[PDB]
């Protein structure tokens, strides 16, 4: 099995830049295919047979290389170019590269924070989840802090990051604090705090069980 190495694992780019992604092979390869996979969708053929532009693909994509080294070039990088990119070789044992993720750089953005109390349905089942949405911020690095009646809480929280948005290059996060109905009704005030580098002053969303 021919090993295809893609460097680097993660590629950073700014709008309007021209980037080059590389694919190194463990042995000689006659031709290389290239594939793009955006989030939520299926992989799509960009370049086939080293340098041939596939249908439904802009001319700003171009593939070069030969032997054991092949390159994918993207000119005028747009926000929609945020995806994973795979190279591919066809032989008696076809393989794919490990993939290169293209992250898009952009202006810093503060998260719009929304907080939600447990639903009437979940409480009836005896559960209680408090959900906090931190949508459309940049960069990805951010911490969320849960305060129950003033005291910080770390147990029972689960955080999920989206992939980089293809429209505005931003990120979103979902923070869920899960308790028992008894534990939830044992306190009154519930607060989630968003500390992002866009401001020293955190963004605070809260409600009272009253």
């Amino acid at each position: 099995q021919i090993v295809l190495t893609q460097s680097p694992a993660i590629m950073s780019a700014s709008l309007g830049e021209e980037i080059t992604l590389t694919c190194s092979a463990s042995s000689s390869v006659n031709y290389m295919h290239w594939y793009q996979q955006k989030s939520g969708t299926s992989p799509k053929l960009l370049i086939y047979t080293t340098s041939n532009l596939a249908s439904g693909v802009p001319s700003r994509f171009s593939g070069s290389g030969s032997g054991t080294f092949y390159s994918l070039t993207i000119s005028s990088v747009e926000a929609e170019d945020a995806a994973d990119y795979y190279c591919h070789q066809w032989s008696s044992y076809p393989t794919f590269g490990g993939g290169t993720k293209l992250e898009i750089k952009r202006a810093d953005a503060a998260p719009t924070v929304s907080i939600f109390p447990p639903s009437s349905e979940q409480l009836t089942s005896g559960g209680a989840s408090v959900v906090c949405f931190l949508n459309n911020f940049y960069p990805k690095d951010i911490n969320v802090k849960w305060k129950i009646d003033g005291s910080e809480r770390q147990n029972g929280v689960l955080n999920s990051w989206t992939d980089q948005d293809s429209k505005d290059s931003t990120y979103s996060m979902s923070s869920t604090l899960t308790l028992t109905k008894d534990e939830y009704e044992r306190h009154n005030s519930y607060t989630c705090e968003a500390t992002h580098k866009t401001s020293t002053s955190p963004i605070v969303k809260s409600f009272n069980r009253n």
Binding site: Y93, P94, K101, F133
Partner: protein
């Protein structure tokens, strides 16, 4: 050209994994018709194909337990994988010649555990815009698809990847609409869980 994978989402270990790819637009009497699977960690593995004249070609490491057949009278081709283990848990795709067009793909999980349907909890609260959501909790196995108003709101929707908890999965989805839209108009999240053959439609109340 459109491709569509279909078949069970759960296969007990040592049993046989079967999937169908329905092709519309072109006939499978031309070109090449491949099967490809993807593991967690951006790992793609080519499985095999069947071509225009019925010839097959398989991944050497899969050849001993893989079979690809076709039904030209239905314009479909099938995938058969025997004696599956946990290692075979992956997202299976069907794709055309040179992998030009792919199907939506389907996540097949190898396990002896029963399917557990998801509970769908609404997320509701001023502002010119309002953020709504649905909490999808306590299901197995992956995945689920959350759509708002039959895809009418795909722009503004955030799909947060599922995380594992106590053997059960939990994900969430948010949607942002003009304050004029909700709750003046009905906004409903539809959660599909194919493994349990379950669809839950939760309406957002103010």
């Amino acid at each position: 050209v459109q491709l569509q994978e279909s078949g069970p989402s759960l296969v007990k270990p040592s049993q046989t994994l079967s999937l169908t790819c329905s092709v519309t637009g072109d006939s499978i009497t031309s070109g090449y018709w491949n099967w490809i699977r993807k593991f967690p960690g951006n790992r793609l593995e080519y499985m095999g194909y069947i071509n225009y004249s019925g010839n097959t070609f398989y991944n050497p490491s899969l050849k001993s337990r893989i079979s690809i057949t076709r039904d030209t009278s239905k314009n479909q081709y099938c995938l058969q994988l025997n004696s599956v283990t946990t290692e075979d848990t992956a997202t299976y795709y069907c794709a055309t010649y040179r992998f030009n067009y792919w199907g939506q793909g389907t996540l097949v999980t190898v396990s002896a555990a029963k399917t557990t349907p998801p509970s769908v909890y609404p997320l509701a609260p001023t502002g010119s815009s309002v953020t709504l959501g649905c909490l999808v909790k306590g299901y197995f196995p992956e995945p689920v698809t959350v759509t708002w108003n039959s895809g009418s709101l795909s722009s503004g929707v955030h799909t947060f990847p599922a995380l594992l908890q106590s053997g059960l999965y939990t994900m969430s989805s948010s949607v942002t609409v003009p304050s004029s839209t909700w709750p003046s108009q009905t906004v409903t999240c539809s959660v599909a869980h194919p493994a349990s053959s379950t669809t839950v439609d939760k309406k957002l109340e103010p």
